[PDB]
Design a protein around this ligand. Sequence first.
Ligand code: W43
Ligand code: W43
Lengths: 236, 59, 59, 273, 273, 57, 255, 40, 40, 40
Amino acid sequence: GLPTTTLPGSGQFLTTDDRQSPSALPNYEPTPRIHIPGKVHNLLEIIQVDTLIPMNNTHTKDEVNSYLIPLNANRQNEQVFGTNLFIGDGVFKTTLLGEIVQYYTHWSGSLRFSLMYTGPALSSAKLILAYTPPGARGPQDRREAMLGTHVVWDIGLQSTIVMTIPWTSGVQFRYTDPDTYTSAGFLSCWYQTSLILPPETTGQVYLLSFISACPDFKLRLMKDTQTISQTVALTE
Amino acid sequence: GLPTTTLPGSGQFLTTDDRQSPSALPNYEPTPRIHIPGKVHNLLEIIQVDTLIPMNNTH
Amino acid sequence: GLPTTTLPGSGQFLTTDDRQSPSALPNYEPTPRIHIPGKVHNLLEIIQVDTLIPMNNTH
Amino acid sequence: TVASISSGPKHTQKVPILTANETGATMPVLPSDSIETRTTYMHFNGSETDVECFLGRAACVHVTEIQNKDATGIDNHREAKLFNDWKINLSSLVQLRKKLELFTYVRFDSEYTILATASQPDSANYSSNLVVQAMYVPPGAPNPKEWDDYTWQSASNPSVFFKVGDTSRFSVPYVGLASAYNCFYDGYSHDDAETQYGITVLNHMGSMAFRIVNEHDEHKTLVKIRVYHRAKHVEAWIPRAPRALPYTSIGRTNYPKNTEPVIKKRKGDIKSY
Amino acid sequence: TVASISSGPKHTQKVPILTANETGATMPVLPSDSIETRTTYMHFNGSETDVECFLGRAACVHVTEIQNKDATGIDNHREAKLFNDWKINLSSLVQLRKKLELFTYVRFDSEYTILATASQPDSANYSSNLVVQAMYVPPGAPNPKEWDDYTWQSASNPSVFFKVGDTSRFSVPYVGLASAYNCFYDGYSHDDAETQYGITVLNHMGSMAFRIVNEHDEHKTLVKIRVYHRAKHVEAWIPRAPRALPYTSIGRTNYPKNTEPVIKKRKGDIKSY
Amino acid sequence: TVASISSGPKHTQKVPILTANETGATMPVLPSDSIETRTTYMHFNGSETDVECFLGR
Amino acid sequence: GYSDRVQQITLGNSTITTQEAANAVVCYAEWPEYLPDVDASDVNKTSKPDTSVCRFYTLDSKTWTTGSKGWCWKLPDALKDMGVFGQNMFFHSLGRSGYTVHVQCNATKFHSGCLLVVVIPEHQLASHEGGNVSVKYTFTHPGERGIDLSSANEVGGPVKDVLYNMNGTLLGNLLIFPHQFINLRTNNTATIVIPYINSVPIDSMTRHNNVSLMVIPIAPLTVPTGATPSLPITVTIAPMCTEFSGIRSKSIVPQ
Amino acid sequence: INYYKDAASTSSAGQSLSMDPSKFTEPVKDLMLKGAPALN
Amino acid sequence: INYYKDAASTSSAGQSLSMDPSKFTEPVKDLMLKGAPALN
Amino acid sequence: INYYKDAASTSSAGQSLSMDPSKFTEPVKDLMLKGAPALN
Ligand SMILES: Cc1cc(CCCCCCCOc2ccc(C3=N[C@@H](C)CO3)cc2Cl)on1
Ligand SMILES: Cc1cc(CCCCCCCOc2ccc(C3=N[C@@H](C)CO3)cc2Cl)on1
């Protein structure tokens, strides 16, 4: 008989501990694995695939239309859309990125925001996208917007433009749940010159917008998502 | 005295676990084995012998 | 199963003991350290800096 | 590892930021393709986002309850909770369910922890000490009918006996019939016109059965069982869109009617911040 | 190591005891610069004044309380202490606080011990055996609303279940967002005219939540939770003046008005012994 | 270990499927003696049918 | 002078040419291949009709109009009646296959509109009834007709709400599945190569569909002034590396 | 590691991995070859 | 040290440290180079 | 022997045995020698 002493914590059950256990089914042989395409190893692998952002959130019931950012022909100087960058809330929240970020407490890294244009091929347009780093207000006019991170996008044969929100930060991690100290800025978009439709054409054209994370990205300290809850256990 | 911590499951009895136990009969000597024809090792050995099927179940 | 005996003191919590514990946050990666001037290692380092004595205590 | 390299002004014919998303790719664009950057290192590995880590902590998967009371004159033990049962599965309580259904096929060993606590809602002199016996009843094996049937002998079926207030823990290998468990299944068990659709049809491994071994004392004792499940040795294939609407049933994808808009409406314009 | 060397009479032009304190230095003067000494050795290392040792013992950081009782008809579990909560921090009880605030920035892993004891202030037949469940709820994660919400499933959030009367112990890595925790912060969360000032703004890691897993017995049971915290792997920068006045609030430096003189007045003259 | 070997058409004078059960033997006939098979491996050892396992709980 | 843009796919006795492609997607970066022995279980030699089943079948055409919500086809169902592919299907106990899907929609440089073409492995549909109502067989086996998401709820059928993918997930996140867009201004076809994806090495072709192909208008069709307000969309699909096993009597399936 | 002195006290035995059905499936005195006629 | 005989009874697995998003982010048939035109 | 995988779970650290008060006691820009005049 070897002398032992038990410490504080004996008998506790910590849902996060990782130890060995007896197998209830001694000697059982599991089914062989066969090959299946698509294996995922890290959630970091999947948040780099871009998905659509319901940017046009202004509706009243969920609709395919809140994915469409409208553009008006012949407007000059004006603003196309605006949003803050609380990736865990608001427009971002239902996107795959938003949806995964919510399983973690802290995030750090660059984001990739792209816009794909869908107007007739014989039209043309020049837009400016601007990222405003924390510390200033959402820009109120392009002059204000153009003094921060921006890209003049020229609509052409190449249909999409990929803007990166480079990680601009004092503190090396931010909260995924919106927090002030930890806030990330604003994203706005304005006409640089203006949309022009060809003859025989009319109305609004739309941009689709996507979001995905750069390879830069870090997420840490897992927790429970506000995105799902329940009141009684389900049954069959 | 070596410091320990006990985990969840301590004291449980799992009918399928396989561990050592003290022998109640210390030092006892079992009867020698003699040879007996017919030893079975796997149930897989015996399910290969065919047996009759009551196919005509209608009684 | 290895035979053990527990000694007096089992289960006690001594605020001054120093042992290992399971991490509640398995696999979490702490923020990198950056350099900060001023690191203290011993209280003996700081009690050698002189400070003023309110000698005139009479107020 | 560098998180960003140093990059300076650019005036090229080589534009990495113009792409064609119609192709289905997400081109790997970085901050340094469109602003001037400085070197910085990652200092991070992505350890805690590994799927083994993501699915590897215990989650509550089931809460049931049984009572110890005089069975004298009870015509239906099962019905008196003289020993309940659970048609095993992992998608009754939803926190863990949304996590698993981020994948289509999943393969893992399970580690179960079972916590049992007792309640004595009406006048008792004391708290008795009950031993629970929770045995695994696969498909094609007698289910117990009374709380003390021959079934409980469990001569071939793994069973664990632990005390109420304590916890029991053991681990079961991956018992799936195929190479992975389906998280989803767009099929039937056969081409029947009325057979059920979905995964309740593949997913079946019979039910787990609990009872108190103790005979009855003078008062009644409620024992409530909580089963926790931790995946170990995880393998996951084919990521899918996360669950947006609430769940209604074990094993079907169905969402409730007149549900509410899941996308938050802006308080303001598209232009609003 | 010598604590003092041998030194004899001196009649020099080299005076180590005259200095200019206006410079900000504390010149390293020793007994042997001004009296005749003999050799003596230190016999000591300064082991127990290491900051790891100074901050490394468990200190009580929080006492809360929850009760097990029939929740039937309770409109606000939180309010009935059917399961309390603690907005985590380390500066409510002050013994440990004064110790930490001897430094400006501090970095360490935490080891928590949680002791839970039960009380039955009014007539009970017995002492029941309750299991506590204390789960960690970070910022941006549902807080439980009832004592038995889906939240308690805690499928992704670390939770520990232990018995009242026992102790639970686990250790959490340094969870700060920056490189160190600030002990002090002369800033705001943004340039707002009315935002709060101080460190309550950086310092936030959501709250810890406790509940009893047991349903109710016939009597009521008070369970009082004490959280102890031990720093391990300590790193401290920039020493500061010790706290002289009493504390009034978590996270602000504020002292109470009409406080009392903190320097003891002489009973006698400056000349008094 | 192969569970089945590959086997193709047969037109022989050597018929493994005709036997005389009166002898008391169970002749070891396989799928590949009477249909055309493809190779497949066992992936299994028969561990949990060992008598030690069968009587050992 | 090779462009990403022009392409030719020849499979069997049938060829497709596109002069306005946008590359092609190969699901999960894997190309269809036959079933290796190491992965095999059924001992039966399989049948590989090759060129008689691995050719291009063009399903009947759809009409995109300003009110369209989107269409959904299931595989192998959509092909249950195409030539010898279909016969083989009803006649063997088990079968396995990959596909090349080519979705076609041309317009002019004055039109606008953008379709999402996506392949979803194991697309288990939801009942519009809620609760645990099932979706009857016939409803998930529309055949070449596919399911029309702008048709009305029917009884025993699936829900046809587009912002929810017919299963409780948001349209916006379908992009995690192999997919390609058809943006009239860029593109005129979409091509996806689908490797066989299952948790078993071979399965039944009638009780289980292993992918749904979905074509969904996202930016509404907008025709030039006084143009007819609609465009046809055509889907052509070719089984590739098909294998059938366990031949017999010929399945009889509901309805 | 055995902690105990007696052999009965050790854990379960380990798989025969013996397996030879012929004592049960082919106990015939003159050997039968599959493919050759049963009765000559 | 494993104390138990079966593999299911061992603790959690250890980090894939595999990580290759290209099956998801770039499943295109003809390789796309960043910087070169998307559609030629 | 660490029984646990993560570094936070190990016991207390071990004595700096670093000790250098000069950053606090003599942060002067031009070095002062004891015995030499303070102000020259
Ligand atoms: C005593 C005792 C009691 C027991 C029970 C052993 C475990 C039996 C159940 C096997 C695990 O079952 C599942 C595994 C995975 C999934 C699963 N559902 C999908 C979403 C994905 O995975 C479901 C079940 Cl029921 O063993 N010994
Ligand atoms: C179950 C379970 C429960 C838990 C909780 C884990 C610990 C969470 C809290 C993290 C530590 O928080 C702090 C560390 C340092 C300081 C600090 N304040 C300044 C004076 C200095 O340091 C404050 C807090 Cl709240 O984890 N698993």
